[PDB]
Design a protein around this nucleic acid. Structure first.
Ligand SMILES: [Cl-]
Ligand code: NA
Ligand code: NA
Ligand code: NA
Ligand code: NA
Lengths: 216, 460
DNA sequence: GGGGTTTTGGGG
DNA sequence: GGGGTTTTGGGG
DNA sequence: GGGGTTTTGGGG
């Protein structure tokens, strides 16, 4: 039994080809999470891991309406309740986005959240980046392995085996090692991109904009 | 500079004192806030190293050393227990009954590290010789001076360190928690275990497979940059680990930025005893092979003993740099690790072909014997951590006509169209090889631009 | 007081 | 000059 | 000091 709500949710999203409709319905309930940080990075925890929520322009406007006495960028150490939310898979540059792995990111899209101002939460372990977890990284590697193996079996055909004479009597034979490089897919660039999940799309606010909207 | 022994240092002076001591434990240097870094260590010497042994239980006694700095680079990275540290200008006080030496490196204090073994950890990793037995391998500030009179102090302390480590555990039982009791700990704890496997999870991270004296196996992530000294078969002390409650598929320890992984000097009695006592466990692997999806890595092969000291080379280097890098061009034999994405030819029955040694031609055995000597002509398409994100798969051959890789499958070449036993074993091997999380550890020989597997055999 | 530095006598 | 430090103004 | 950073958020 997975004690971490975020790990179970994100793992199921990846195990179901990034299809949010295929993830268990009994997991799409409101999320009560502790705000670890709010700026420069807004990070929330579930008592075990921290993830970065992605707020829609609607979500913040609604928040600023029902809660005028509350700045979002100052919610550090406070708790929030995400009533309406969705998850989606996105292709990113993991060298720049720390809340990602192997150029993939499962995003928590927030549509509606209420700040339970001054609610003291239970003592928990130090929160770690879900995208740095051994099992979760492995789960993402499995996801990539499946996509890669499927692409390779579709792309590579005809058994173009190296002729045995090339490696027999190689006394006076010299070759270049790049002769062993085989393209894995019909991808346009040097990066493998032949995935079947449809990259989710949704406009989200940059944490910097919400900072300006609250203190120019 | 006058050097004082640990138990003889003054608790009343509050004046800066100096000493030489053997380091037995240390946190990694860590940041506490916006301007401070700390490194905490446990130190011993001939006057302070063992608790009143009667009802003590051969537990180690020690002083503590807390080093404060404004920069990460001003603190010592302790990769190994048993080396020596020389400290200048430390103030001593009693902290909960024990002797605590404090030193502000950001002010006027300094430290220097000396190797007890012939080479420092970093010098062993890079295969370098030490300048001399009186040269510190690391030190704070822009300069370190060793006076003629210190030479005897250093030499005598080294001799003592070896006597101490070979006669005592040093890291006594009260200094760590058995892995099979890790789940019972309220917070963090320490570990002393043998590294059974170092699995390159990705470009920046190793996954260590650990097993301690209790027989329990645990995995933990270890950054390559942070702990470059991790080696299979070696015993380490892990300072500060926590039990991961959220890992369901395997037992995992979580490490923090202050956590440290420490090896032992050659003379270590504890390390010697654990290297011999703790033995390889494939119980996790065997169990995972029964599951459709294994979150646990399985190294399916083993290389010949004569190669167990050969350093590994990534696929990125093997296929993209072997014709341009000076060091790679001078070698024909390499060791590497990878996972198999696809095996060609697709039909397992065609893995064995008849080979005509005169014409250097192979042919299908569907028509049988008329093709010559039976050989394996298998072509693996592989990938690894170094080439994980690219759009390539790499060819690695198992062409056994000249003897290379003949016993890879533990199945002598035979007509697979006729021998059901051999065909079945190979089909099973094919499924294992292409399964997610299955990896191959192999030695290859470069021949006419291709890499042929040799001195490697499946162990499942 | 004492470093390293240049301030080369004096702030906080 | 400026730190850390305690010397709390002044050495070399 | 048996600990919690980040132009370092895969040494810190
Ligand atoms: Cl060649
Ligand atoms: Na001065
Ligand atoms: Na001066
Ligand atoms: Na001064
Ligand atoms: Na002063």
């Amino acid at each position: 039994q997975q004690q971490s709500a975020f790990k179970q949710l994100y793992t199921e999203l990846f195990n179901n080809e990034g299809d949010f409709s295929k993830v268990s319905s009994n997991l799409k309930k409101p999320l009560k999470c502790y705000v670890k940080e709010s700026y420069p990075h807004f990070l929330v925890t579930d008592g075990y891991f921290f993830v970065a929520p992605y707020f829609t322009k609607e979500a913040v406007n609604e928040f600023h309406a029902k809660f005028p006495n509350v700045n979002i960028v100052d919610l550090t150490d406070k708790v929030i309740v995400i009533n309406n939310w969705s998850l989606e898979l996105r292709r990113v540059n993991s060298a720049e986005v720390f809340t990602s792995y192997a150029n993939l990111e499962a995003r928590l899209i927030v549509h509606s959240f209420k700040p339970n101002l001054q609610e003291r939460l239970n003592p928990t372990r130090y929160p770690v980046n879900l995208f740095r977890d051994d099992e979760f990284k492995t789960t993402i590697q499995h996801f990539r392995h499946t996509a890669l193996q499927a692409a390779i079996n579709k792309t590579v055909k005809g058994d173009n085996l190296v002729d045995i004479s090339k490696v027999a009597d190689a006394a006076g034979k010299k070759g270049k090692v790049d002769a062993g490089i085989v393209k894995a897919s019909a991808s346009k660039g040097d990066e493998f991109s032949d995935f079947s999940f449809k990259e989710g799309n949704t406009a989200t606010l940059k944490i910097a904009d919400i900072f300006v909207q609250e203190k120019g | 500079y006058e050097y004082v022994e640990l138990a003889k240092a003054s608790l009343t002076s509050a004046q800066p004192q100096h000493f030489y001591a053997v380091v037995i434990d240390a946190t990694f240097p860590y940041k506490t806030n916006q301007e401070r870094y700390i490194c905490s260590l446990k130190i011993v010497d001939p006057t302070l190293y063992l608790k009143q042994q009667k009802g003590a239980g051969d537990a180690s006694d020690y002083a503590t050393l807390v080093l404060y700095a404004k920069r990460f680079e001003d603190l010592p990275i302790i990769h190994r227990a048993g080396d020596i540290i020389r400290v200048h200008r430390a103030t001593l006080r009693l902290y909960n009954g024990q002797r605590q030496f404090n030193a502000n490196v950001f002010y006027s204090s300094s430290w220097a590290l000396f190797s007890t073994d012939k080479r420092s950890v970093t010098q062993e990793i890079n295969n370098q010789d030490a300048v001399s037995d009186t040269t510190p391998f690391s030190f704070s500030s822009k300069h370190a001076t060793i006076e003629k009179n210190e030479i005897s102090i250093l030499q005598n302390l080294r001799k003592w360190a070896n006597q101490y480590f070979s006669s005592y555990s040093v890291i006594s039982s009260d200094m760590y928690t058995a892995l099979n009791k890790a789940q019972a700990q309220k917070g963090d704890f320490d570990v002393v275990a043998k590294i059974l496997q170092v699995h390159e999870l990705d470009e920046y991270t190793n996954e260590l497979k650990l097993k301690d004296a209790s027989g329990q196996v645990f995995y933990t992530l270890s950054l390559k940059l942070k702990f470059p000294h991790v080696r299979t078969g070696e015993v380490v002390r892990i300072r500060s680990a926590t039990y991961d409650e959220t890992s369901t598929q395997k037992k995992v320890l979580i490490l923090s930025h202050y956590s440290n992984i420490i090896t032992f000097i050659q003379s270590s009695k504890l390390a010697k005893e654990l290297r011999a006592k703790i033995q390889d466990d494939h119980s996790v692997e065997v169990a995972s092979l029964k599951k459709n999806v294994s979150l646990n890595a399985v190294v399916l092969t083993e290389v010949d003993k004569k190669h167990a000291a050969l350093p590994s080379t990534s696929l990125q280097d093997l296929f993209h740099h072997a014709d341009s890098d000076k060091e790679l061009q001078a070698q024909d034999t390499f060791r590497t690790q990878f996972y198999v994405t696809k095996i060609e030819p697709s039909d397992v029955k065609e893995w064995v072909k008849g080979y005509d040694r005169k014409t250097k031609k192979s042919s299908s055995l569907k028509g049988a014997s008329g093709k010559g000597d039976n050989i394996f002509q298998v072509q693996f398409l592989v990938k690894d951590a170094s080439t994980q994100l690219n759009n390539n798969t790499y060819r690695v051959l198992l062409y056994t006509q000249d003897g290379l890789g003949a016993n890879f499958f533990n199945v002598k070449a035979d007509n697979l169209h006729k021998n059901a036993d051999a065909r079945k074993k190979l089909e099973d091997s094919a499924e294992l090889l292409t399964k997610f999380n299955s990896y191959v550890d192999a030695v290859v020989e470069r021949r006419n631009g291709f890499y042929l597997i040799k001195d490697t055999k499946l162990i499942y």
